[PDB]
């Protein structure tokens, strides 16, 4: 490759040397996509080798098998695993695909053409050709729209998706008539991210999920056609920066946003991340402990409507600030939790006393007890329970692991966006290397700072 | 051509001739920060007692309610609200807005927006001055820590009542409750963070002493040595190669920074990356990943548990734990 | 300790974001040669910025 | 300690501030 003398970029910034080498840049990308597909397949095979069927998947440290099972592979009613073969198929398909992608990346990085414009002008681009760059962006929006419509097809006609809101405790369901109402779909988008609203984390049914996917697939395809058939308008030219580093910084800000929202999805959402596969959510575990001890103290002959706590505010039932009946104790902070084993027990006034008394279900109470014993609190040695516990439970929730790692990645990628937005701005300006030392702008300004 | 009203306002905002730069990040930073400053000062002076725990007992927190500067603290939002957005206009009156912890959630939201736009304004002034732009990146580490303790920990735990109270003894309370619940001391990210402030102090003392130890003689003994430097001079005011020689034969000849830009890069990057790691540690412990758990790790041949230093740490943790929320628990597991 | 870690980070960042050019290369670490009688960074620019 | 603390704080404000003001006014007098 190149060195410091020929490029001005040191080894620890070596990829910048291939900013303006289109073929080598393509090779780096294809080899990287080979790595992502490779990790997906290799870790999928590792998980299905280390998978155990008499345990739920949140107890074995699994992050990809829950993702496959949410699509409706190898699981049936109750979220119980029936076949590890679809998971095996996904793993091996990804591993072979990564072999092909890795060959493409290695070829284009090592012996591929250095720059693509002199021989392949269709793929030839420079970072200032806005027409070509929007063409590439449009191609990729059609690709992502086909991915979203692929999920739409999977939910509509190819076995459906796992619905944790199905009666009985969750089952794979063919989605029929997804919501196409723009008001309902974009109300999630313009929603506040605070409690009770949660922005788009509070999507709670696959009807909304698949409808938003229809919507986003169609917008992606339309915007892809639009970007192929247009060029950015003069206001966009005057506002944006048009360097490859600038496009990188825009992508970094957007994927940092995606990482933060993915953290909050994994932590709070239970319809795209069913608790049968991922373990209970944070609110789910505390509400579960309250609900279990409520039914045990009904079985031990006591009235739970009465019997105020040590503060006189209610041991088992109390009032939320908005007026409904919620579980007492500190779990009142999680009073806005919504799950499959509380909604059949919830009336218009929140929790209904007579329904809590008579219309209990055994599957709901064992689900609640199992969610109580498997709360997302553990150590990074994978020692379940709070920091004061004993090394006796080897368990940390996949929700914990996913939310943790993806907040870390989203934050570092926001910082990378900062770095690259600044470097792209200063590079377009001309002082990415420093001040002129003879035409320093600070010496030309007035005194007194 | 410079005639239009938006032109006059725009060139005033981007003007580098103002005593304090405003800029486009400043048009957000200034009003949010004055909002947070005004509410923080008024609340610290005379905020009525705030019910932090959700159990109908408030913590006073304000000087006019008998608190001194060390104790006084803007007490977090109530536990009953949770992560619900609680503006003044949402509350029935200002008085119960105060009692449920409204000033805290207001000041924290405005402080978030203020520090984010302070970072943007730092980048902006460096762009307008022909500078290199990464002071915003270096400032992103205390911003990361502020977000981690004021918003990210409340999101992970489920209520702004778990945020850091805006005060001194309230901060100490946050640290003690946090160690009780998550074992921050045994978390590797907090170890990197502690190493970051200890190293920042170490290399700050080292850089300052090596530069002061090599200042070129220009003044007399009866004048401040600082008077040997005039603002805007182009000469090097200290002997960099002599300080290198001293440092090399003091620690390692070859493992010493022979480049001043290398030395300043290490100075910039070491505490910044370590504060990034400790801010992310607080974020990890928001989602309950917790520190190292070595409680009853060591056992004998009979299987009998040998107490260790981590076990004494754990006994201290149980002491801290059985006192936080003395009346707010109804259930044995602390899942909230 | 907190102010000293602040001083470490802020001094390093200020020096490296007020560097003079001396360049002809995208890496700035090689624009420094330690046997010179000239400053590497603009104390004036740093003072104005802060 | 309610009025003894007040006079302690008062003297701690006044004596070093007065000393510093001596020195600063002396300096700014001579240009």
């Amino acid at each position: 490759g190149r060195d410091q003398e020929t490029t001005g970029f040191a080894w620890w910034a070596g990829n910048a040397r291939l900013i303006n080498l289109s073929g080598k840049l393509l090779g780096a990308h294809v080899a990287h996509a080979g790595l992502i597909v490779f990790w997906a397949g290799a870790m999928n095979l590792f998980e299905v080798s280390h998978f155990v069927p008499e345990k739920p998947m949140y107890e074995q440290g699994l992050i990809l098998l829950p993702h496959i099972a949410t699509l409706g592979y190898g699981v049936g009613p109750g979220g119980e695993v029936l076949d590890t073969f679809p998971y095996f198929v996904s793993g091996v398909l990804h591993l072979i695909s990564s072999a092909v992608l890795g060959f493409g990346g290695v070829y284009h990085s090592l012996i591929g053409p250095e720059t693509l414009e002199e021989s392949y002008p269709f793929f030839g681009y420079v970072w200032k050709d806005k027409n070509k760059m929007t063409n590439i962006l449009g191609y990729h929006l059609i690709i992502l729209g086909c991915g979203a419509w692929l999920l739409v097809l999977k939910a509509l006609y190819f076995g459906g998706v796992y619905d944790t809101w199905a009666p009985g405790g969750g089952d794979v369901r063919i989605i029929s008539n997804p919501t196409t109402n723009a008001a309902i779909i974009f109300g999630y988008i313009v929603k506040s991210p605070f409690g009770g609203d949660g922005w788009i984390v509070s999507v709670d049914n696959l009807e909304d999920i698949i409808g938003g996917h229809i919507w986003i697939g169609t917008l992606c395809i339309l915007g892809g056609i639009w970007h192929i058939y247009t060029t950015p308008w003069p206001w966009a030219r005057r506002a944006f920066v048009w360097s490859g580093e600038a496009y990188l910084s825009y992508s970094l800000a957007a994927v940092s946003l995606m990482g933060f929202t993915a953290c909050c999805f994994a932590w709070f959402n239970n319809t795209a991340y069913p608790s049968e596969f991922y373990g209970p959510t944070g609110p789910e575990a505390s509400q579960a402990q309250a609900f279990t001890f409520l039914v045990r103290d009904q079985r031990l002959g006591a009235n739970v409507a009465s019997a105020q706590g040590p503060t006189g505010l209610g041991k088992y039932l109390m009032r939320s600030p908005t007026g409904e009946i919620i579980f007492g104790g500190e779990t009142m902070r999680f009073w806005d939790f919504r799950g499959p084993w509380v909604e059949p027990l919830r009336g218009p006034s929140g929790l209904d006393l007579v329904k809590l008394k008579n219309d209990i279900q055994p599957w709901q109470e064992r689900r609640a007890a199992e969610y109580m014993t498997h709360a997302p609190l553990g150590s990074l040695n994978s020692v379940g329970g709070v920091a004061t516990e004993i090394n006796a439970v080897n368990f940390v929730s996949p929700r914990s692991w996913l939310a943790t790692s993806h907040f870390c990645l989203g934050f570092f990628f926001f910082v990378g966006h900062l770095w690259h937005a600044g470097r792209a701005r200063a590079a377009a300006a001309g002082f990415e290397k420093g001040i002129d030392r003879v035409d320093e702008p600070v010496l030309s300004m007035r005194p007194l700072d | 051509e410079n005639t239009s009203l938006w032109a006059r306002f725009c060139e005033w905002i981007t003007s580098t001739e103002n005593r304090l730069y405003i800029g486009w990040f400043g048009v957000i930073m200034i009003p949010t920060l004055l909002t947070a400053i005004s509410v923080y000062i008024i609340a610290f002076i005379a905020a009525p007692p705030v019910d932090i725990d959700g159990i109908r007992e408030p913590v006073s927190g304000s000087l006019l309610y008998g608190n001194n500067i060390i104790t006084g603290a803007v007490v977090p939002t109530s536990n009953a609200i949770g992560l619900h957005f609680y503006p003044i206009w949402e509350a029935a009156s200002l008085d119960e807005w105060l009692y449920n912890g409204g000033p805290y959630q207001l000041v924290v939201c405005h402080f978030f927006l203020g520090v984010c736009c302070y970072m943007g304004r730092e980048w902006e002034l460096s762009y307008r001055l022909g500078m290199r732009p990464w002071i915003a990146v270096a400032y992103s580490a205390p911003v990361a820590a502020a977000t981690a303790v004021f918003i990210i920990y409340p999101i992970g735990q489920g209520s702004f009542s778990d945020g850091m109270p805006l005060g001194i003894s309230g901060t100490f309370n946050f640290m003690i409750v946090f160690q009780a619940e998550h074992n921050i001391l045994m978390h590797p990210f907090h170890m990197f963070g502690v190493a970051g402030v200890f190293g920042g102090s170490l290399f700050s003392a080292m850089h300052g002493s090596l530069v002061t130890s090599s200042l070129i003689r220009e003044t007399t003994e009866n004048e401040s040595a600082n008077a040997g430097y005039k603002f805007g001079q182009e000469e090097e005011t200290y002997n960099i190669v002599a300080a290198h020689g001293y440092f090399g034969r003091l620690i390692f000849q070859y493992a010493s920074f022979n480049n001043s830009r290398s030395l300043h890069f290490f100075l910039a990057v070491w505490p910044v990356v370590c504060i990034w790691l400790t801010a992310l540690g607080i974020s990890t412990m928001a989602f309950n990943l917790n520190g190292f758990n070595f409680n009853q790790s060591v056992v004998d041949s009979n299987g009998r548990v040998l107490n260790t230093w981590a076990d004494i740490i754990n006994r201290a943790n149980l002491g801290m734990e059985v006192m936080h929320e003395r009346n707010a628990h109804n259930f044995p597991l602390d899942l909230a | 300790v907190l102010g000293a870690a602040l001083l470490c980070a802020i001094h390093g960042a200020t020096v490296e974001n007020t560097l003079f050019e001396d360049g002809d290369g995208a890496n700035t670490f090689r624009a420094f040669n330690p046997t010179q009688a000239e400053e590497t960074y603009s104390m004036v620019t740093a003072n104005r910025f802060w | 300690v309610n009025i003894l603390g007040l006079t302690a704080t008062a003297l701690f404000i006044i004596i070093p501030t007065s000393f510093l003001l001596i020195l600063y006014v002396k300096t700014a007098a001579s240009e």
């Binding site: 005194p447 700072d449 | 000087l63 | - | 704080t9």
Partner: peptide, 30 residues
């Protein structure tokens, strides 16, 4: 009565900050 003294000390420090920002010795650049 202590609160008066605390408020005095705090706004006194704030006044010191105001004066040190807006009434400083300017950099002479000579």
């Amino acid at each position: 009565m202590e609160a008066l003294v605390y408020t005095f000390l705090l706004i006194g420090t704030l006044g010191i900050i105001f004066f040190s920002i807006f009434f400083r010795e300017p950099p002479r650049i000579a």
